[PDB]
Amino acid sequence: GVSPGELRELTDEELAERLRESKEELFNLRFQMATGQLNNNRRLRTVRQEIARIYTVLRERELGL
RNA sequence: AAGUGUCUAAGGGCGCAUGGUGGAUGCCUUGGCAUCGAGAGCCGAUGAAGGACGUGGGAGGCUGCGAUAUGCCUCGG
Ligand SMILES: [Mg+2]
Ligand SMILES: [Mg+2]
Ligand SMILES: [Mg+2]
């Protein structure tokens, strides 16, 4: 998973693009799991956690980091 | 001829032998009861107490959490 330390250099738009990419990846993983071709089921939790990480970074950046 | 004379058990009773059922007794316990010594004595429109509905790779309950959903960040151990 992407680390907060290496996340904290993207300014705002790179963070937003990363969040969009992560949401798309999570969507794809959900579909693959639904149709039964996903083997490593830990990927869903990993992607959910990195989405939460990006959201946390954005929010704390807004609220006087 | 006259006379004397057993036994059996369809079922039943008593006593043993050997089983069944049942869960008393004995011995226990992540459960209670009664106090003692320290704290803290309020929470809420910055939305409470308490909930409904969801959330995990696999159905449900409990427990945690809230679409960032058995979790996110920071500092300590
Ligand atoms: Mg008899
Ligand atoms: Mg008989
Ligand atoms: Mg640590």
PDB file of C-alpha atoms (C1' of nucleotides) and ligand atoms in Angstrom:
ATOM      1  CA  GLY A   1       0.000   0.000   0.000  1.00  0.00           C
ATOM      2  CA  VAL A   2       0.996   3.596  -0.651  1.00  0.00           C
ATOM      3  CA  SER A   3       2.457   5.245   2.423  1.00  0.00           C
ATOM      4  CA  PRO A   4       1.272   8.527   3.961  1.00  0.00           C
ATOM      5  CA  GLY A   5       4.826   9.832   3.943  1.00  0.00           C
ATOM      6  CA  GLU A   6       5.121   9.382   0.188  1.00  0.00           C
ATOM      7  CA  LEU A   7       1.559  10.640  -0.260  1.00  0.00           C
ATOM      8  CA  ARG A   8       2.270  13.931   1.495  1.00  0.00           C
ATOM      9  CA  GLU A   9       4.135  15.447  -1.492  1.00  0.00           C
ATOM     10  CA  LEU A  10       1.338  15.471  -4.068  1.00  0.00           C
ATOM     11  CA  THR A  11      -0.309  18.854  -3.835  1.00  0.00           C
ATOM     12  CA  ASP A  12      -4.061  18.627  -4.441  1.00  0.00           C
ATOM     13  CA  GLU A  13      -4.794  17.602  -8.011  1.00  0.00           C
ATOM     14  CA  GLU A  14      -2.402  14.667  -7.980  1.00  0.00           C
ATOM     15  CA  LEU A  15      -4.143  13.536  -4.794  1.00  0.00           C
ATOM     16  CA  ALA A  16      -7.552  13.857  -6.456  1.00  0.00           C
ATOM     17  CA  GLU A  17      -6.337  11.904  -9.483  1.00  0.00           C
ATOM     18  CA  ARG A  18      -4.925   9.209  -7.202  1.00  0.00           C
ATOM     19  CA  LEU A  19      -8.270   8.981  -5.408  1.00  0.00           C
ATOM     20  CA  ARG A  20     -10.108   8.620  -8.711  1.00  0.00           C
ATOM     21  CA  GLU A  21      -7.662   5.929  -9.830  1.00  0.00           C
ATOM     22  CA  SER A  22      -8.136   4.062  -6.557  1.00  0.00           C
ATOM     23  CA  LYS A  23     -11.925   4.213  -6.824  1.00  0.00           C
ATOM     24  CA  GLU A  24     -11.755   2.864 -10.372  1.00  0.00           C
ATOM     25  CA  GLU A  25      -9.448   0.058  -9.240  1.00  0.00           C
ATOM     26  CA  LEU A  26     -11.793  -0.809  -6.373  1.00  0.00           C
ATOM     27  CA  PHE A  27     -14.712  -0.900  -8.809  1.00  0.00           C
ATOM     28  CA  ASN A  28     -12.826  -3.306 -11.055  1.00  0.00           C
ATOM     29  CA  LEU A  29     -11.888  -5.505  -8.100  1.00  0.00           C
ATOM     30  CA  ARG A  30     -15.503  -5.619  -6.926  1.00  0.00           C
ATOM     31  CA  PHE A  31     -16.612  -6.762 -10.368  1.00  0.00           C
ATOM     32  CA  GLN A  32     -13.853  -9.378 -10.584  1.00  0.00           C
ATOM     33  CA  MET A  33     -14.777 -10.751  -7.166  1.00  0.00           C
ATOM     34  CA  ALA A  34     -18.465 -10.815  -8.104  1.00  0.00           C
ATOM     35  CA  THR A  35     -17.805 -12.833 -11.254  1.00  0.00           C
ATOM     36  CA  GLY A  36     -15.342 -15.037  -9.391  1.00  0.00           C
ATOM     37  CA  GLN A  37     -11.954 -14.478 -11.033  1.00  0.00           C
ATOM     38  CA  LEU A  38     -10.261 -12.703  -8.105  1.00  0.00           C
ATOM     39  CA  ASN A  39      -7.720 -14.801  -6.215  1.00  0.00           C
ATOM     40  CA  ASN A  40      -6.068 -12.438  -3.716  1.00  0.00           C
ATOM     41  CA  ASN A  41      -9.056 -11.116  -1.797  1.00  0.00           C
ATOM     42  CA  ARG A  42      -6.841  -8.913   0.401  1.00  0.00           C
ATOM     43  CA  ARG A  43      -6.641  -6.407  -2.448  1.00  0.00           C
ATOM     44  CA  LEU A  44     -10.092  -5.044  -1.629  1.00  0.00           C
ATOM     45  CA  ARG A  45      -9.111  -4.199   1.941  1.00  0.00           C
ATOM     46  CA  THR A  46      -5.806  -2.742   0.753  1.00  0.00           C
ATOM     47  CA  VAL A  47      -7.513  -0.474  -1.780  1.00  0.00           C
ATOM     48  CA  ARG A  48     -10.196   0.590   0.689  1.00  0.00           C
ATOM     49  CA  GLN A  49      -7.484   1.513   3.174  1.00  0.00           C
ATOM     50  CA  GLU A  50      -5.525   3.566   0.659  1.00  0.00           C
ATOM     51  CA  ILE A  51      -8.711   5.405  -0.350  1.00  0.00           C
ATOM     52  CA  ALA A  52      -9.284   6.223   3.314  1.00  0.00           C
ATOM     53  CA  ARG A  53      -5.655   7.337   3.566  1.00  0.00           C
ATOM     54  CA  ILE A  54      -5.991   9.761   0.659  1.00  0.00           C
ATOM     55  CA  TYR A  55      -9.209  11.171   2.092  1.00  0.00           C
ATOM     56  CA  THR A  56      -7.543  11.658   5.476  1.00  0.00           C
ATOM     57  CA  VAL A  57      -4.598  13.460   3.903  1.00  0.00           C
ATOM     58  CA  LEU A  58      -6.881  15.769   1.938  1.00  0.00           C
ATOM     59  CA  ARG A  59      -9.023  16.594   4.961  1.00  0.00           C
ATOM     60  CA  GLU A  60      -6.064  17.309   7.226  1.00  0.00           C
ATOM     61  CA  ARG A  61      -4.528  19.472   4.510  1.00  0.00           C
ATOM     62  CA  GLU A  62      -7.723  21.525   4.451  1.00  0.00           C
ATOM     63  CA  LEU A  63      -7.915  21.775   8.247  1.00  0.00           C
ATOM     64  CA  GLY A  64      -4.579  23.504   8.868  1.00  0.00           C
ATOM     65  CA  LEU A  65      -2.141  20.582   8.617  1.00  0.00           C
TER      66      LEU A  65
ATOM     67  C1'   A B   1     -61.913-102.545  47.039  1.00  0.00           C
ATOM     68  C1'   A B   2     -60.874 -98.924  51.049  1.00  0.00           C
ATOM     69  C1'   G B   3     -57.085 -95.610  52.515  1.00  0.00           C
ATOM     70  C1'   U B   4     -52.456 -92.417  52.477  1.00  0.00           C
ATOM     71  C1'   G B   5     -49.525 -89.751  49.192  1.00  0.00           C
ATOM     72  C1'   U B   6     -46.214 -85.633  45.352  1.00  0.00           C
ATOM     73  C1'   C B   7     -45.173 -82.097  41.181  1.00  0.00           C
ATOM     74  C1'   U B   8     -46.712 -78.072  37.527  1.00  0.00           C
ATOM     75  C1'   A B   9     -47.943 -71.353  37.336  1.00  0.00           C
ATOM     76  C1'   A B  10     -51.890 -68.701  32.708  1.00  0.00           C
ATOM     77  C1'   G B  11     -50.549 -64.934  36.025  1.00  0.00           C
ATOM     78  C1'   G B  12     -48.871 -62.934  40.969  1.00  0.00           C
ATOM     79  C1'   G B  13     -45.681 -61.927  45.795  1.00  0.00           C
ATOM     80  C1'   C B  14     -40.978 -61.676  48.470  1.00  0.00           C
ATOM     81  C1'   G B  15     -35.362 -61.769  48.266  1.00  0.00           C
ATOM     82  C1'   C B  16     -31.100 -61.618  45.489  1.00  0.00           C
ATOM     83  C1'   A B  17     -27.997 -61.015  40.580  1.00  0.00           C
ATOM     84  C1'   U B  18     -27.700 -57.870  36.432  1.00  0.00           C
ATOM     85  C1'   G B  19     -29.413 -53.801  33.376  1.00  0.00           C
ATOM     86  C1'   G B  20     -32.242 -49.207  31.822  1.00  0.00           C
ATOM     87  C1'   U B  21     -34.273 -44.445  32.849  1.00  0.00           C
ATOM     88  C1'   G B  22     -33.487 -40.172  35.814  1.00  0.00           C
ATOM     89  C1'   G B  23     -30.265 -36.426  37.407  1.00  0.00           C
ATOM     90  C1'   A B  24     -30.129 -36.118  43.445  1.00  0.00           C
ATOM     91  C1'   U B  25     -25.488 -36.099  46.116  1.00  0.00           C
ATOM     92  C1'   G B  26     -20.253 -34.891  46.336  1.00  0.00           C
ATOM     93  C1'   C B  27     -16.474 -31.736  44.388  1.00  0.00           C
ATOM     94  C1'   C B  28     -15.956 -27.411  40.981  1.00  0.00           C
ATOM     95  C1'   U B  29     -16.776 -22.331  38.385  1.00  0.00           C
ATOM     96  C1'   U B  30     -14.902 -16.217  33.187  1.00  0.00           C
ATOM     97  C1'   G B  31     -21.492 -15.792  37.523  1.00  0.00           C
ATOM     98  C1'   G B  32     -23.643 -13.196  41.576  1.00  0.00           C
ATOM     99  C1'   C B  33     -24.383 -10.704  46.773  1.00  0.00           C
ATOM    100  C1'   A B  34     -22.680  -7.369  50.756  1.00  0.00           C
ATOM    101  C1'   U B  35     -19.103  -4.069  52.143  1.00  0.00           C
ATOM    102  C1'   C B  36     -14.329  -1.204  52.632  1.00  0.00           C
ATOM    103  C1'   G B  37     -10.501   2.462  50.560  1.00  0.00           C
ATOM    104  C1'   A B  38      -9.769   5.700  46.763  1.00  0.00           C
ATOM    105  C1'   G B  39     -11.707   8.683  42.489  1.00  0.00           C
ATOM    106  C1'   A B  40     -15.267  11.039  39.207  1.00  0.00           C
ATOM    107  C1'   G B  41     -19.437  13.342  40.065  1.00  0.00           C
ATOM    108  C1'   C B  42     -22.712  15.168  34.794  1.00  0.00           C
ATOM    109  C1'   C B  43     -23.933  14.400  29.055  1.00  0.00           C
ATOM    110  C1'   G B  44     -26.657  17.597  25.008  1.00  0.00           C
ATOM    111  C1'   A B  45     -28.261  22.266  18.993  1.00  0.00           C
ATOM    112  C1'   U B  46     -20.227  21.585  17.743  1.00  0.00           C
ATOM    113  C1'   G B  47     -26.906  17.251  17.901  1.00  0.00           C
ATOM    114  C1'   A B  48     -26.947  13.650  23.722  1.00  0.00           C
ATOM    115  C1'   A B  49     -28.907   9.040  26.108  1.00  0.00           C
ATOM    116  C1'   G B  50     -30.772   5.101  23.207  1.00  0.00           C
ATOM    117  C1'   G B  51     -31.504   3.004  18.478  1.00  0.00           C
ATOM    118  C1'   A B  52     -32.564   1.456  12.904  1.00  0.00           C
ATOM    119  C1'   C B  53     -29.980   0.210   8.731  1.00  0.00           C
ATOM    120  C1'   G B  54     -25.313  -1.206   6.868  1.00  0.00           C
ATOM    121  C1'   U B  55     -19.887  -2.627   7.098  1.00  0.00           C
ATOM    122  C1'   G B  56     -15.462  -8.439   7.012  1.00  0.00           C
ATOM    123  C1'   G B  57     -13.249 -13.290   1.570  1.00  0.00           C
ATOM    124  C1'   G B  58     -17.028 -16.924   2.868  1.00  0.00           C
ATOM    125  C1'   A B  59     -24.763 -17.385   6.094  1.00  0.00           C
ATOM    126  C1'   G B  60     -26.191 -15.543  11.185  1.00  0.00           C
ATOM    127  C1'   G B  61     -25.636 -13.685  16.253  1.00  0.00           C
ATOM    128  C1'   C B  62     -22.329 -10.930  19.625  1.00  0.00           C
ATOM    129  C1'   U B  63     -18.568  -7.098  19.558  1.00  0.00           C
ATOM    130  C1'   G B  64     -16.038  -2.937  16.809  1.00  0.00           C
ATOM    131  C1'   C B  65     -16.964   0.654  13.351  1.00  0.00           C
ATOM    132  C1'   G B  66     -20.030   4.378   9.828  1.00  0.00           C
ATOM    133  C1'   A B  67     -20.136   4.764   2.600  1.00  0.00           C
ATOM    134  C1'   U B  68     -12.797   6.725   4.803  1.00  0.00           C
ATOM    135  C1'   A B  69     -17.497   1.523   7.807  1.00  0.00           C
ATOM    136  C1'   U B  70     -13.464  -5.241  12.873  1.00  0.00           C
ATOM    137  C1'   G B  71     -11.343   0.785  10.190  1.00  0.00           C
ATOM    138  C1'   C B  72      -7.711   6.422   8.524  1.00  0.00           C
ATOM    139  C1'   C B  73      -3.590   9.946  10.600  1.00  0.00           C
ATOM    140  C1'   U B  74      -0.075  11.600  14.513  1.00  0.00           C
ATOM    141  C1'   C B  75       2.643  10.805  18.914  1.00  0.00           C
ATOM    142  C1'   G B  76       4.131   7.166  22.776  1.00  0.00           C
ATOM    143  C1'   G B  77       4.667   1.869  24.782  1.00  0.00           C
TER     144        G B  77
HETATM  145 MG    MG C   1     -44.748 -69.231  39.052  1.00  0.00          MG
HETATM  146 MG    MG C   2     -45.804 -67.445  31.223  1.00  0.00          MG
HETATM  147 MG    MG C   3       4.422   2.897  16.745  1.00  0.00          MG
END
